[PDB]
Swiss-Prot record, chains A, B:
Pathway recorded for this protein: Amine and polyamine biosynthesis; carnitine biosynthesis
Domain of life, source organism: Eukaryota
InterPro entries: AlphaKG_dependent_hydroxylases, GBBH-like, GBBH-like_N, GBBH-like_N_sf, TauD-like_sf, TauD/TfdA-like
Required cofactor(s): Fe(2+); L-ascorbate
Modified residues (Phosphoserine): S351
Coiled coil start-end: none
Protein name: Gamma-butyrobetaine dioxygenase
Enzyme class: oxidoreductase
Upper lineage: Eukaryota, Metazoa, Chordata, Craniata, Vertebrata
Function: Catalyzes the formation of L-carnitine from gamma-butyrobetaine.
Residue numbers binding Zn(2+): C38, C40, C43, H82
């Protein structure tokens, strides 16, 4: 009744097609969009699922010359005699009503978000299950998207596990620190991470204009002298900051901060960027946090009078993150892997003691959100069908 | 005289340090920024060139307790007895005056831009020279940044050349189409590019939220039946559109368009994104164009009344690109490689004839701008020193 055509007609100087569906609802389709989206073999390359039609061939003032319909299809003639057929269900899905458009966006982009603080129950799956079963990998990625973190247990205590997960997703995101990298204490460390010191809450790689979307950390070796992990839900913390201190929020969501990274690892590098620490979209929603205190540059490109208030705002933000209501702490054991949203969470680590042998060793890697969301879409189709 | 300290003193309740330089100019440095940027081994990890100091250790209302200076350094005591030394030239570089800040940003980010139309003289270097000499690679990357395109001549007519350039930069940007990819006519093409058809002006991969910054195309085999290249300076064309048709500019710079790519290549994929075709920064400057007509989705997430005006605006934009004043056309020969800014230029190709043997073959790859700018910074230092 909802996908069955009761009537189709050309309206508004034939610039619009209206479908009355068998449930009595009406949908409206611009003529120019119909022509633009003709599925015929001239207009559309089926093997690529791509449009061949050029903008140059599209008359933007086009109207429907003629139209007939049955219950499942519309058949349209255009003024230059081009001919097009459209399927009812194809049309229904792409209905321009707000409700239809929003429904479809949800299906494409999986916007459901669960904010958390110290009450978090760390979502936890089995490593091998996720590698072997689509039902488990689907749970893994959908929970990663929704909650921002998933722990996988039961990996080996050897290198190569994050690469298996990289492959399960598709491929890992190569950076100057390599395809994967070893978090351990290193002589002449090229990064604070490769010492025994504490890492305060941070996101990884704000020195890049496109920071890693997803980070993977596999515990190979753990120390009893410290090295606990801590995480915080940056989107939750931003929400609290906007409420508690709107001026601080405004400063952090409007001030461009310089980040830097210079050294040698996978190859030699000298990286520079600018980001707002709180990055809003065009509707004012926080979409990414970009903050690492280690790699924030000495160079600070703001007028002198904005400097101290920036620092005062950053301090408020960090105090909220550290609050016992926001923070979630846990300790990784050999064989655990955490995978999290590096655009949303901030993460850190407690200090531990140095010594002559390596007492602590993680293997890390990054992935891109477009790569993960692709895999998520494919898994959903496989598991639902 | 400009980098030599004549006087240094604490002002404004000791919250500010003022340096009077020997040229009589004065610079001002907030106390909190000085403390934040203490270079001592407690505060700063020299092997990483990174800050160890935590936001949590920083008192945002800090003032200078004491200060002495000589011509080359300031020596500061803080209220908790921490102690810091700062070098004069280090201070001068990071001066908070607008002129000093702008000068340094230019040095970091190479903002110089040369807009062009059909008068372009295609910058051209020798392939092997660029691989062998820093002076040539430096010219290559700086011209790529400034002009948006450089042709390299004298490569071989075999696969593997774009990878050599990838290595010269650092590393290539892996996508679902592989590390490198072959542009040629293919049975069951997964992409319009892999047919003999015409490609209208487009940027590559707007289906990704982070499209490739730089694209490399190496002509292995060329056809005499067509296959000419065309390029346009998207930043130049956007400037003309804003002047000629502000309403069209506004629509394209504010309307989110859905892009899609589904299929199998390096692995199986189902990619979706949203972009404004003209992407402005926070000051209203165009920073990226995101437009491929083949991969623009059938799904169009706007109210029905915005649809036809969007198409009318897109048409104006494409007509400007096609204008004989904007367009630059040329033909690649075996052994040529073009490298261009895929955020700024749009590119295309004339149709050619199909047949039973492959008459036309390019090898392509992508790179990230942060990777290229890193290499550019390193090369400049090597060539200037
Ligand atoms: C060195 N690793 C652990 C890869 C982190 C790099 C990103 P950070 O923001 O310096
Ligand atoms: C298939 N290549 C040539 C790699 C282009 C992919 C990006 P396009 O926007 O579809
Ligand atoms: O070592 C840890 O527990 C966490 N490591 C990091 O956050 C890192 O390397 O970026
Ligand atoms: O084939 C050409 O000349 C140009 N190719 C492309 O623009 C492409 O593959 O994206
Ligand atoms: N069943 C309708 C078929 C319409 C074909 C018309 C071709 N011009
Ligand atoms: N030449 C000045 C050295 C100052 C050292 C002071 C240590 N508190
Ligand atoms: Zn058609
Ligand atoms: Zn980290
Ligand atoms: Zn110090
Ligand atoms: Zn292209």
């Amino acid at each position: 009744m909802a996908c069955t055509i009761q009537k189709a007609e050309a309206l508004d100087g034939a610039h619009l097609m209206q479908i009355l569906w068998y449930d009595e609802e009406e949908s409206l389709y611009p003529a120019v969009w119909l022509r633009d989206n003709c599925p015929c073999s001239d207009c559309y390359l089926d093997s690529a699922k791509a449009r061949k039609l050029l903008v140059e061939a599209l008359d933007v003032n086009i109207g429907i010359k003629g139209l007939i319909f049955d219950r499942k299809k519309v058949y349209i003639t255009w003024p230059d005699e081009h001919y097009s057929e459209f399927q009812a269900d194809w049309l229904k899905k792409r209905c321009f009503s707000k409700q239809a458009r929003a429904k479809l966006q949800r299906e494409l982009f999986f916007p459901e978000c669960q904010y958390w603080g110290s009450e978090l129950q760390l979502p936890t799956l089995d490593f091998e299950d996720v590698l072997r079963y689509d039902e488990h990998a689907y749970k893994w990625l959908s929970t990663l998207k929704k909650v921002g973190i998933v722990r996988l247990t039961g990996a080996s205590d050897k290198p190569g596990e994050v690469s298996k997960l990289g492959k399960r997703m598709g491929f890992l995101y190569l950076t100057f620190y390599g395809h994967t990298w070893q978090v351990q204490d290193k002589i002449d460390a090229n990064n604070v991470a490769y010492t025994t010191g504490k890492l305060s809450f941070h996101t990884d790689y704000p020195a890049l204009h496109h920071p890693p979307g997803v980070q993977l950390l596999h515990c190979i070796k753990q120390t009893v002298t410290g090295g606990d992990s801590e995480i915080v839900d940056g989107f939750n913390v931003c929400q609290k900051l906007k409420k508690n201190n709107p001026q601080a929020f405004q400063i952090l969501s409007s001030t461009f901060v310089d980040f830097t990274d210079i050294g040698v690892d996978y190859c030699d590098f000298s990286v520079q960027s600018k980001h707002k620490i709180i990055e809003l979209d065009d509707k004012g929603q926080v979409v990414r946090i970009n903050f690492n205190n280690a790699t924030r540059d000495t160079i600070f490109d703001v007028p002198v009078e904005r400097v101290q208030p920036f620092y005062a705002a950053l301090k408020e933000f960090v105090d909220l993150m550290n609050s016992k209501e926001s923070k979630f702490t846990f300790k990784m054991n050999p064989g655990d892997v955490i995978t999290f949203d590096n655009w949303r969470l901030l993460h850190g680590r407690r200090s531990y003691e140095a010594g002559t042998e390596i007492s602590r060793h993680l293997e890390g890697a990054y992935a891109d959100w477009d790569v993960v969301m692709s895999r998520l879409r494919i898994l959903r189709q496989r598991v639902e069908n």
